RNA sequence: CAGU
């Protein structure tokens, strides 16, 4: 891309094949994703985690929360399982950067996975924004990402509500998830990022509510972030729940890819919190709730990172641009692929 | 930059 910026990066053949062929998501991948929301294997994993860590922290409170794509219903059989281990009722505590205690806890847990004959330690990432332990649960073979941060569980619950209220959202996310993998873009643009882009797009079509309109104040807080939401019936908002049909899905996907092919990433951001068209990067910070403003006043270093090629704001952790690591050339690659994909969908 |  960098060598020939003037050339539209060719949509990879693996992607072209799947776009030109949409019945697979509707008839096969959807039922598997729906089944993967609840399977017996997850109970074994949570139980074995409690059994493994209960001795390491004897009197301490302990609770395990599942989240991620398997739980929201856009997973596949190879999908990893994401788990939040809360030791000591830290659910409501927000760490911008992982604290010493948090890193201390992760280090203690690392040893337990190594020594245990039911777990294989795969990786221990301490210096990430969200430190995680990557380990294989050997009885099931399921790869688990273990963290000490509640935010992923909270946005998983929000996706659950959105997908169940408007199933078209779920189908589209399964499709673009697979499209992202066949385009080999997942390392720059994550499945979670594209899910927020789908949600935002459908908000602009008046098929989903702005997240802010679900949070009119009693607030549940993880630090400064409002993590609960009114589970309002879509009828009360006049939001029609569409029947997901292959033509309906195809038309919305076409429009989705067309929209992000022409989106002005230099001046606007994807903003499911606001859920309105043309949210300017230059205006967004003054549009956020009072807790965000109070938090960044005391900590200006924790404001959302807006000076990035691609800005997609987490609807709950409002200081997180989930696409902050996307490069100009990764963005151009994504824009070119959107362009060619919209064409192939007519 | 790494879970989501
Ligand atoms: Mg996952
Ligand atoms: Mg994971």
DSSP letter string over A151-180? HHHHHHHHHHHHHHH-HHHHHHHHHHHHHH
Instruction: Tell me: is residue A80 an annotated ligand-binding position.
Output: yes
Q: How many CB atoms lie within 10 A of CB A40?
A: 8
| Distance measured from the CA of protein residue A323 to the C1' of nucleotide B1, in angstroms | 10
CB A55 within 8 A of CB A61: no
Which nucleotide, over all strands, has the C1' atom closest to the CA of A153?
B4
Instruction: Tell me: is residue A145 an annotated ligand-binding position.
Output: no
Q: Where are the alpha helices (DSSP H) in chain A?
A: 13-20, 23-24, 30-36, 40-53, 69-72, 100-115, 151-165, 167-182, 191-204, 246-262, 290-298, 328-344
Q: Which ligand is nearest to the CA of A191?
A: 1
Distance separating the N- and C-terminal Cα atoms of chain A: 26
| Distance measured from the CA of protein residue A247 to the C1' of nucleotide B3, in angstroms | 35
Report the largest interatomic distance among the alpha carbons of chain A, rounded to a whole angstrom: 63
The H or E element spanning position A300 is none
Resolution in units of Å: 1.9
Contacts of residue A50, defined as CB under 8 A and 6 or more positions apart, other chains included, come to A62, A64
Nucleotides of B under 7 A from a protein CB: 1-4
Which nucleotide, over all strands, has the C1' atom closest to the CA of A323?
B1
| Distance measured from the CA of protein residue A61 to the C1' of nucleotide B1, in angstroms | 33
Which nucleotide, over all strands, has the C1' atom closest to the CA of A190?
B4
- Residue A53 CA to ligand 2 center (angstroms) comes to 20
Q: How far apart are CA A208 and CA A333, in angstroms?
A: 28
Q: Which ligand is nearest to the CA of A156?
A: 1
Structure determination method: X-ray
Q: How far apart are CA A276 and CA A255, in angstroms?
A: 16
Please state at what angle helix A40-53 crosses helix A100-115, rounded to 10 degrees. 110
């Amino acid at each position: 891309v960098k060598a020939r910026q003037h050339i539209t990066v060719r949509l990879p053949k693996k992607a072209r094949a799947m776009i030109v062929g949409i019945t697979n998501v509707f008839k096969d991948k959807y039922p598997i994703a729906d089944k993967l929301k609840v399977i017996p294997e997850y109970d074994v994993i949570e139980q074995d985690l409690c059994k493994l860590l209960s001795p390491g922290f004897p009197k301490q409170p302990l609770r395990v929360y599942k989240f991620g794509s398997r739980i929201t219903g856009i997973g596949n059989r190879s999908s990893d399982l994401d788990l939040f281990v809360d030791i000591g009722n830290t659910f409501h505590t927000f760490e911008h950067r992982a604290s010493n205690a948090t890193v201390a806890k992760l280090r203690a847990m690392r040893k337990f996975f190594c020594d245990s004959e039911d777990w294989r330690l795969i990786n221990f990432i301490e210096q990430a924004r969200v430190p995680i332990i990557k380990t294989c649960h050997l009885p099931t073979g399921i790869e688990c990402d273990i963290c000490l941060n509640s935010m992923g569980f909270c946005n998983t619950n929000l996706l659950k509500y959105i997908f169940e209220s408007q199933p078209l959202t779920q189908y589209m996310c399964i499709y673009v998830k697979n499209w992202l993998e066949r385009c080999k873009l997942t390392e720059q643009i994550s499945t979670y990022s594209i899910t927020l882009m789908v949600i935002y797009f459908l908000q602009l079509q008046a098929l989903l509510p702005p997240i802010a309109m679900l949070q009119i104040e009693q607030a549940v807080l993880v630090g400064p972030w409002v993590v609960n939401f009114a589970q309002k019936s879509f009828s009360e908002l006049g939001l029609q729940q569409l029947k997901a049909t292959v033509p309906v899905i195809k038309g919305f996907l076409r429009n989705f890819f067309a929209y992000f092919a022409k989106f002005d990433y230099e001046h606007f951001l994807v903003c499911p919190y606001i859920g309105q068209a043309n949210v300017e990067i230059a205006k967004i910070e003054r549009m956020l709730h009072a807790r965000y403003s109070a938090y960044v006043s005391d900590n200006p270093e924790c404001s959302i990172q807006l000076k990035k090629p691609m800005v997609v704001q987490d609807p709950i952790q409002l200081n997180h641009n989930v696409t902050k690591a996307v490069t100009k050339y990764g963005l151009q690659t994504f824009v070119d692929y959107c362009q060619q994909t919209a064409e192939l969908l007519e």
